[PDB]
């Protein structure tokens, strides 16, 4: 937790420590008081948000393409906490 | 001085005797050169405070950071490596809400009376 | 007999809510507001004298409990009413206090003198609120008189450590509204008590004179204070929250 | 290893399309967030900040 | 056997148990009355109001206790630190009913020794309300450093721990009254009395009249008198506070 | 000042500090031994000093 | 108290088949060395007539004659080192600070410079009467093994 | 017994639960049943009545 956070700092704004070290608190803050989850776990309502994106741009076949990357993902095995990985991507575009 | 520090730190956690207080003061000195032979506070500092956040202390997360910074916009009146001192003292780190106060409370004297008990029916 | 013991802690918790016990029978008889707790019959007197040194307990329970939904159901407005909001706050740790000693005697081992000791902490809690309440009754306090009924309590639980702290908080909580309603009478000269909150009688330099019944918390001379701040707006470190209503006051003459 | 590869891959796959402005190195400490049961609600907002 | 353990209990938890205690009136030991009889009885009732007496001459103090203030505020303040140690007596007797019921250890003799450290602490307790019926500090404030005057180092922990605390409305009407000459008594929790002497326009004259009837122990005469004059030039440790009132003397002379 | 506001943050750490102790080991901080190495001498110190303490 | 719980040892024991007439006298035996001289020092410091001083100095040959015998030799040590504990410290503060109070006469010198510096045979010393004088008048001029060297060293701060 | 534990977190929900009840001037009525448990716990289950009472307004 407290390293892999300070990383996201450090990558993002290029800077080593004690430059990012305003910004850590910040982070610190947001994250910890809010820590676990706030919504019941669901990976479908997450999917179906991240391909009604792709309709309402009129971006048709990557909306298709999308739902064979879905199962490439899921079945590696590899990764499970799913909805939270792609919920954060669905937010970010 | 450094030499005397040494023995005023042994003979503080004591607050034969005389014995003692060389014997105590033999180990201050060799773990100091055994020590020898072999990231910023600040930042230590936060992550202590994201511990406590996930917790549920936010009052004290907030309370720890505010007076961490207020001691970096003065300049300390008997301190002079704050840095340092900070850092010492973080290597040595370490409805419902009313009920899980109150149950904590009552369930730590609790555990008091059986260990008063238990050690007696030990002597026996 | 540990047996016997056993249905009485049981029956107590009922006492403790203030309903109806299985053993021990609840009665006012007092127009306070206060309820006197009768232990009835035993073969046993041990169990009859244990009984009864935890009843002085829901005694003073009884008395804050009853008077601050007296002041809810029948309607005031009034900073006895915020009293009685701090007082109802105290009463919040007090009855989860009476639902963790009743979870530990669903895996029941409590014994009526184990237990007592935890009911002597929320003893002097209640003890303190109990004889502030039945002093409140017998005055018929409204408005300021509440407020310097209760810094006569400040003075007098100051050696008592744990005393001293609920009656700060009372007059403390029961000033931060009492001292609002007077920064909202520095910004608009004319205010609405839905009884009387404040000692400013409303029917030149406009006549804003003062019943002498209500007053701040302290002492006459800082009420001197803000009777003239109101006369030229026609034109401790609690009582310099007074002294920058009068400072305001110099430069608007 | 080599699963773990396959996957960032799909992953990586699953960024381009949405325009999100994560490389390989900014995806894999999301991840890493992501699996340790943090809200991904807080870890979006901080994100922000930080490209500021 | 093991009811008559559970009968000497409750003479420690309250007063009485199974059996009334007394006689005539009085509170020496308790009937005969028990199921079994030894000679080892005589004994085993002369070690059940051993320290009987003394428990329900101090809850009894508490039971008197309910003024919000009169005749003195000191006497009360008192009367509130041995509350706190009749508390703690209370947790020495939760952990005697653990052992003698269900949730040898129902032999009489293991909770003998075990309120044994408990009979030289509750008994001088016992000793040092019949020592204190002063209400105005000074007759109390020299009480309990009268018994760090005798030996024994189970008893001067009591009495230094309530040092302190008859000492707490003495020092917190004293640092206000260095500083402003504030006034927060109508009964009294401080050695001069207040206003005596009505003011007037001064010469610089008495308006404080001092007695030297009660005077604490970490005061004196000479002590006492010397704070009076800063509450006119205004308008624990039993030999460091006469230093630091003197400090007080010389920061208000300065 | 500076003294009763870190006697807060040592004990909002909850350490094992006291406000004696604290004392003398910011002289040594000043007198520039490392703070890595006046840790391991803090704990060194205490566990001889209590082992020495429930003999008496 | 650490007799009475020996009591409570033997008779947790008494509730099984075990204890009798000679199983309980080795137990019996540290102790009985233990209270015998512990009750030959009660006689005469009572009966005696010995308070203060005095006491210390019958402590003090008990730890002579209490040679022979190991744990003889550790009561009345640990007696006569119990019995000091209040009594050095009355003199400490006399030859440290220059304040003294006597109010039962603690310490041997009781006041009333022209304050008197009394060296009393009812609280005779320990230590040698001539040393005594060295605690004396340390206090002379602030009043308006190893024990001797703290009066020594107390001795040479104020002259 | 459990069952009547139940039955209350209905008459927040509601008015009604296992017992038929009514509100008249105040207040969810209570049938406990069949004695067989404490009379005192349908005085717990009073305090809980106006706020199914509290709930219909």
Same mark, same amino acid.
């Given at each position: 937790?407290?390293?892999?956070?300070?990383?996201?700092?450090?990558?993002?704004?290029?800077?080593?420590?004690?430059?990012?070290?305003?910004?850590?608190?910040?982070?610190?803050?947001?994250?910890?008081?809010?820590?676990?989850?706030?919504?019941?776990?669901?990976?479908?309502?997450?999917?179906?948000?991240?391909?009604?994106?792709?309709?309402?741009?009129?971006?048709?076949?990557?909306?298709?393409?999308?739902?064979?990357?879905?199962?490439?993902?899921?079945?590696?095995?590899?990764?499970?906490?799913?909805?939270?990985?792609?919920?954060?991507?669905?937010?970010?575009? | 001085?450094?030499?005397?520090?040494? #023995?005023?730190?042994?003979?503080?956690?004591?607050?034969?005797? %005389?014995?003692?207080?060389?014997?105590?003061?033999?180990?201050?000195?060799?773990?100091?050169?055994?020590?020898? =032979?072999?990231?910023?506070?600040? %930042?230590?500092?936060?992550?202590?405070? =994201? %511990?406590?956040?996930?917790?549920?202390?936010?009052?004290?997360?907030?309370?720890?950071?505010?007076?961490?910074?207020?001691?970096?916009?003065?300049?300390?009146?008997?301190?002079?490596?704050?840095?340092?001192?900070?850092?010492?003292?973080?290597?040595?780190? #370490?409805?419902?809400?009313?009920?899980?106060?109150?149950?904590?409370?009552?369930?730590?004297?609790?555990?008091?009376?059986?260990?008063?008990?238990?050690?007696?029916?030990?002597?026996? | 007999?540990?047996?016997?013991?056993?249905?009485?802690?049981?029956?107590?918790?009922?006492?403790?809510?203030?309903?109806?016990?299985?053993?021990?029978?609840?009665?006012?008889?007092?127009?306070?507001?206060?309820?006197?707790?009768?232990?009835?019959?035993?073969?046993?007197?041990?169990?009859?004298?244990?009984? *009864?040194?935890?009843?002085?307990?829901?005694?003073?329970?009884?008395?804050?409990?009853?008077?601050?939904?007296? *002041?809810?159901?029948?309607?005031?407005?009034?900073?006895?009413?915020?009293?009685?909001?701090?007082?109802?706050?105290?009463?919040?740790?007090?009855?989860?206090?009476?639902?963790?000693?009743?979870?530990?005697?669903?895996?029941?081992?409590?014994?009526?003198?184990?237990?007592?000791?935890?009911?002597?902490?929320?003893?002097?809690?209640?003890?303190?609120?109990? &004889?502030?309440?039945?002093?409140?009754?017998?005055?018929?306090?409204?408005?300021?008189?509440?407020? &310097?009924?209760?810094?006569?309590?400040?003075?007098?639980?100051?050696?008592?450590?744990?005393?001293?702290?609920?009656?700060?908080?009372?007059?403390?909580?029961?000033?931060?509204?009492?001292?609002?309603?007077?920064?909202?009478?520095?910004?608009?000269?004319?205010?609405?008590?839905?009884?009387?909150?404040?000692?400013?009688?409303?029917?030149?330099?406009?006549?804003?004179?003062?019943?002498?019944?209500?007053?701040?918390?302290?002492?006459?001379?800082?009420?001197?204070?803000?009777?003239?701040?109101?006369?030229?707006?026609?034109?401790?470190?609690?009582?310099?929250?007074?002294?920058?209503?009068?400072?305001?006051?110099?430069?608007?003459? | 290893?080599?699963?773990?590869?396959?996957?960032?891959?799909?992953?990586?796959?699953?960024?381009?399309?949405?325009?999100?402005?994560?490389?390989?190195?900014?995806?894999?400490?999301?991840?890493?967030?992501?699996?340790?049961?943090?809200?991904?609600?807080?870890?979006?907002?901080?994100?922000?900040?930080?490209?500021? | 056997?093991?009811?008559?353990?559970?009968?000497?209990?409750?003479?420690?938890?309250?007063?009485?148990?199974?059996?009334?205690?007394?006689?005539?009136?009085?509170?020496?030991?308790?009937?005969?009355?028990?199921?079994?009889?030894?000679? @080892?009885?005589?004994?085993?009732?002369?070690?059940? @109001?051993?320290?009987?007496?003394?428990?329900?001459?101090?809850?009894?103090?508490?039971?008197?206790?309910?003024?919000?203030?009169?005749?003195?505020?000191?006497?009360?303040?008192?009367?509130?630190?041995?509350?706190?140690?009749?508390?703690?007596?209370?947790?020495?007797?939760?952990?005697?009913?653990?052992?003698?019921?269900?949730?040898?250890?129902?032999?009489?003799?293991?909770?003998?020794?075990?309120?044994?450290?408990?009979?030289?602490?509750?008994?001088?307790?016992?000793?040092?309300?019949?020592?204190?019926?002063?209400?105005?500090?000074?007759?109390?404030?020299?009480?309990?450093?009268?018994?760090?005057?005798?030996?024994?180092?189970?008893?001067? @922990?009591?009495?230094?721990?309530?040092?302190?605390?008859?000492?707490?409305?003495?020092? /917190?009407?004293?640092?206000?009254?260095?500083?402003?000459?504030?006034?927060?008594?109508?009964?009294?929790?401080?050695?001069?009395?207040?206003?005596?002497?009505?003011?007037?326009?001064?010469?610089?004259?008495?308006?404080?009249?001092?007695?030297?009837?009660?005077?604490?122990?970490?005061?004196?005469?000479?002590?006492?008198?010397?704070?009076?004059?800063?509450?006119?030039?205004? /308008?624990?440790?039993? /030999?460091?506070?006469?230093?630091?009132?003197?400090?007080?003397?010389?920061?208000?002379?300065?």
């Amino acid at each position: 937790p407290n390293v892999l956070l300070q990383n996201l700092c450090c990558r993002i704004l290029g800077k080593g420590e004690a430059d990012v070290a305003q910004q850590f608190q910040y982070a610190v803050r947001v994250i910890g008081s809010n820590f676990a989850p706030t919504v019941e776990r669901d990976e479908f309502l997450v999917t179906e948000k991240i391909k009604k994106e792709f309709v309402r741009q009129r971006r048709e076949a990557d909306g298709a393409l999308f739902s064979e990357l879905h199962r490439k993902l899921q079945s590696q095995g590899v990764l499970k906490n799913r909805w939270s990985i792609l919920y954060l991507l669905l937010s970010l575009s | 001085s450094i030499t005397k520090l040494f #023995g005023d730190l042994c003979e503080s956690h004591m607050v034969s005797k %005389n014995r003692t207080k060389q014997t105590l003061k033999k180990l201050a000195y060799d773990t100091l050169f055994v020590h020898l =032979f072999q990231l910023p506070v600040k %930042n230590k500092i936060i992550m202590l405070s =994201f %511990n406590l956040r996930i917790c549920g202390m936010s009052s004290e997360a907030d309370r720890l950071e505010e007076l961490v910074e207020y001691l970096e916009q003065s300049n300390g009146i008997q301190i002079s490596d704050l840095h340092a001192v900070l850092e010492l003292l973080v290597e040595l780190s #370490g409805v419902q809400v009313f009920e899980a106060d109150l149950g904590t409370t009552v369930a730590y004297q609790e555990l008091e009376i059986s260990t008063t008990i238990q050690r007696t029916l030990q002597i026996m | 007999l540990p047996s016997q013991e056993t249905c009485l802690v049981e029956d107590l918790l009922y006492i403790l809510i203030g309903v109806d016990g299985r053993y021990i029978s609840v009665q006012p008889l007092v127009g306070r507001q206060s309820r006197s707790f009768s232990v009835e019959q035993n073969l046993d007197s041990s169990v009859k004298e244990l009984v *009864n040194r935890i009843l002085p307990v829901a005694t003073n329970y009884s008395t804050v409990t009853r008077f601050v939904e007296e *002041n809810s159901s029948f309607e005031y407005g009034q900073v006895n009413h915020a009293l009685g909001a701090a007082m109802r706050t105290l009463g919040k740790e007090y009855m989860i206090l009476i639902s963790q000693l009743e979870h530990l005697q669903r895996q029941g081992l409590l014994s009526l003198q184990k237990l007592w000791f935890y009911i002597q902490p929320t003893l002097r809690t209640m003890e303190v609120l109990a &004889s502030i309440a039945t002093s409140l009754n017998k005055g018929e306090c409204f408005g300021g008189a509440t407020l &310097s009924l209760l810094h006569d309590r400040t003075f007098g639980y100051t050696g008592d450590s744990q005393a001293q702290e609920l009656c700060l908080y009372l007059t403390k909580a029961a000033s931060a509204p009492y001292f609002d309603i007077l920064e909202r009478w520095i910004y608009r000269g004319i205010i609405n008590d839905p009884y009387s909150e404040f000692m400013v009688e409303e029917h030149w330099d406009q006549r804003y004179t003062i019943v002498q019944q209500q007053i701040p918390s302290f002492l006459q001379k800082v009420a001197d204070k803000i009777l003239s701040t109101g006369k030229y707006l026609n034109v401790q470190a609690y009582v310099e929250r007074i002294e920058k209503a009068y400072n305001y006051a110099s430069k608007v003459l | 290893m080599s699963a773990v590869r396959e996957t960032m891959d799909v992953l990586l796959e699953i960024s381009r399309l949405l325009n999100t402005g994560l490389d390989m190195e900014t995806l894999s400490i999301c991840v890493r967030l992501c699996e340790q049961g943090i809200n991904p609600e807080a870890l979006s907002s901080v994100i922000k900040e930080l490209r500021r | 056997e093991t009811s008559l353990v559970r009968d000497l209990l409750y003479v420690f938890q309250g007063i009485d148990g199974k059996f009334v205690k007394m006689c005539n009136s009085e509170n020496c030991y308790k009937v005969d009355g028990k199921v079994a009889v030894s000679k @080892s009885l005589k004994d085993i009732t002369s070690k059940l @109001s051993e320290l009987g007496w003394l428990h329900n001459k101090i809850k009894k103090y508490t039971d008197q206790r309910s003024l919000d203030r009169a005749f003195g505020l000191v006497g009360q303040s008192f009367c509130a630190a041995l509350h706190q140690e009749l508390k703690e007596y209370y947790r020495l007797l939760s952990v005697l009913h653990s052992q003698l019921q269900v949730e040898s250890s129902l032999t009489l003799r293991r909770l003998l020794v075990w309120t044994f450290d408990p009979k030289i602490r509750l008994k001088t307790l016992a000793a040092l309300v019949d020592h204190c019926q002063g209400r105005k500090g000074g007759e109390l404030a020299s009480a309990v450093h009268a018994y760090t005057k005798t030996g024994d180092p189970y008893m001067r @922990s009591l009495v230094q721990h309530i040092l302190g605390l008859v000492a707490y409305p003495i020092l /917190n009407f004293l640092y206000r009254w260095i500083y402003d000459g504030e006034l927060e008594d109508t009964y009294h929790e401080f050695f001069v009395a207040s206003d005596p002497v009505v003011k007037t326009d001064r010469l610089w004259h008495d308006k404080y009249s001092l007695r030297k009837s009660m005077i604490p122990s970490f005061m004196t005469m000479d002590q006492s008198r010397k704070v009076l004059l800063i509450g006119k030039s205004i /308008n624990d440790l039993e /030999n460091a506070f006469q230093t630091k009132i003197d400090a007080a003397y010389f920061d208000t002379s300065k």
